[PDB]
Amino acid sequence: SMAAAAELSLLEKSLGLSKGNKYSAQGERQIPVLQTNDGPSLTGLTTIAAHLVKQANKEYLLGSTAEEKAIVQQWLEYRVTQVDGHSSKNDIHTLLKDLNSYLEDKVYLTGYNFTLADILLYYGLHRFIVDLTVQEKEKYLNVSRWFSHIQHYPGIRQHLSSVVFIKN
Amino acid sequence: MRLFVSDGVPGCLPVLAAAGRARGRAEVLISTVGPQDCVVPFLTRPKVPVLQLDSGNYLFSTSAICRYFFLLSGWEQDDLTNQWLEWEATELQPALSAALYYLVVQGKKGEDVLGSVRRALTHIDHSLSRQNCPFLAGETESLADIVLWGALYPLLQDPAYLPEELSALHSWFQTLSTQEPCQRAAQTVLKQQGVLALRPYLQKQPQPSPA
């Protein structure tokens, strides 16, 4: 996976934060830590991410209803427990299959609104999707469509490699 | 809405405790299903608890389900609560899973069980102690308390695994357990059987790392 500090720099930019925060790392898993303004500590990738979203005044990215907020947090958790818990190509195929089924009738993770869940799942899946064969990208067509859409969403991709899709 | 639970699945503890928060906002139907039953259409492998929302979407994460119930009651997201829920997911659950493995699958006792969670328990105790409030983030129990109580209950319901030097933890845990929704949840999930009820679920789990 991307180092959390690298991911948080990406997110900051996507958000439009000026800014540059300094993140320390805690424990053996190098969990990111943010010295807040001001000034208790905030610890954990998705925790800090939701704080930056508020800081940027783009809280709609966290969901606009009770249901959407719950769904956003479910996919953020999924990102830090399921996606970051695998490597290479094995396990990942069950995951992709499930994600593929879920996205059959959805543009974004929550439905029709783009959220922080889409950003972080895209950052988290990039290392796997970039290694997919043409065959696999056709097998997981709904994942491909969602990923292709996010990677062109304004200011989200940055320096990350574009993945070739056809259409579709 | 319909909430799907199963006997002896520990994840059903916090959701059952949280479900009352939906009162006056929506109706939660409770449905008991089998361990290998697949309720979520997009998930290959059986998963419980699951909440089928009135919109037809599914929540398959226990913490997200508890969050949704609290949000319906008017609760508002805060950083401290997110911090606790992320820690519960990524640091406590595997520590707890390992301890419960050694305890209910491999029949160990004492520090062979406690060893894998003492660090986590101590962290909770020290958080409660440095705060002057009785609950994790607030004057009254809230989302973080229910989620953490739900994860801890299958182990800490046995006093052998709640070290008394961790006095803040002990007080907090005992207080939550005696609240009515927590009492009802423990009865429904464990019935009367204590921790043994969990055995079948714990068998299927991956094994832990090292000592």
Return the HEC string of chain B.
Answer: CEEEECCCCCCHHHHHHHHHHHCCCCCCEEEECCCCCCCCCCCCCCCCCEEECCCCCEECCHHHHHHHHHHHCCCCCCHHHHHHHHHHHHHHHHHHHHHHHHHHHCCCCCHHHHCCCHHHHHHHHHHHHHCCCCCCCCCCCCHHHHHHHHHHHHHHCCHHHCCCCCHHHHHHHHHHHCCHHHHHHHHHHHCCCHHHHHHHHHHCCCCCCCC
Please give the structure tokens belonging to residue A14: 């996507």
Do A40 and A4 fall into the same domain? yes
Q: Which of B171, B182, B75 is nearest to B128 (CA)?
A: B171
Do A96 and A144 fall into the same domain? yes
Task: With respect to residue A65, please indicate whether it lies within any of the assigned structural domains.
Answer: yes
Query: What resolution in Å is listed for this PDB structure?
Result: 2.0
Q: Which residues of B145-181 are buried (b: 16+ CB within 10 A; e: fewer)?
A: bbbbbbbbbbbbeeeebbbeebebbbebbeebbeeeb
Task: With respect to residue A33, please indicate whether it lies within any of the assigned structural domains.
Answer: yes
Q: Where in chain B is the domain with CATH 3.40.30.10?
A: 1-74+180-211
Question: How many domains is chain A built from?
Answer: 2
Do A61 and A38 fall into the same domain? no
The three-state secondary structure class of A108 is strand
Sign of the CA dihedral running B96, B98, B101, B107: negative
Do A36 and A95 fall into the same domain? no
- Which B-chain residues 25-64 have CB contacts (< 8 A) with chain A? 41-45, 53, 55, 57, 59-61, 63-64
Give the span between the Cα atoms of B5 and B2, in whole angstroms: 10
Q: What is the DSSP letter of A148?
A: H
Answer yes or no: are the C-beta atoms of A107 and A150 closer than 8 Å.
Answer: no
Task: With respect to residue A76, please indicate whether it lies within any of the assigned structural domains.
Answer: yes
Domain extent for A36: 1-56
Please give the structure tokens belonging to residue B207: 């094994």
Burial class of A17 by CB neighbour count within 10 A (0 to 12, 13 to 18, 19+) = middle
Q: Where in chain B is the domain with CATH 1.20.1050.10?
A: 75-179
Question: Which CATH number do you get for residue A93?
Answer: 1.20.1050.10
CATH of B75-179, one of 1.20.1560.10, 1.20.1050.10, 3.30.43.10, 3.90.1300.10: 1.20.1050.10
Look at A73 and B42 and tell me if their CB atoms are within 8 Å. Answer: no
Q: What chain A residue is nearest to B68 in terms of C-alpha separation?
A: A70
Distances (CA, A) of B57 to A101, A102, B2, B191: 13, 10, 11, 30
Q: What is the CATH number of domain B1-74+180-211?
A: 3.40.30.10
Decide which of A11, A36, A56 is a domain's last residue: A56
The length of chain A is 168
What is the residue-wise DSSP string for A20-64?
A: ---EEEETTTTEEEEE-TTSSEEESHHHHHHHHHHHTT-GGGG-S
